[PDB]
């Protein structure tokens, strides 16, 4: 479930911060897609209550963190 590792760089709170807000600014439909990333990326996830998700960057991996940034940035755009 890697095939790289080295390619996956760490995510600083700085970037994550602007991401937390951005992801929240996204529309409902956009949220469903994002939440799915962590829901499938996180092993502990997939609880009996799929209508809830606990995203904790404190324990979350860098792969998932950036994963959302790539989806939020691709939609929100910036340039």
């Amino acid at each position: 479930e890697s095939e790289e590792e080295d390619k996956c760089k760490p995510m600083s709170y700085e970037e994550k911060r602007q991401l937390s807000l951005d992801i929240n600014k996204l529309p409902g439909e956009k949220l469903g897609r994002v939440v799915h990333i962590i829901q499938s990326r996180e092993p502990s996830l997939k609880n009996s209550n799929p209508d809830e998700i606990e995203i904790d960057f404190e324990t979350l991996k860098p792969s998932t963190l950036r994963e959302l940034e790539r989806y939020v940035t691709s939609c929100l755009r910036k340039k």
């Binding site: 809830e52 998700i53 904790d56 404190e58």
Partner: peptide
Amino acid sequence: TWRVQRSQNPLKIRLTR
């Protein structure tokens, strides 16, 4: 629609339907 609410954590985003 879906909702979201951060916590005391440094960056814990709680997403829920």
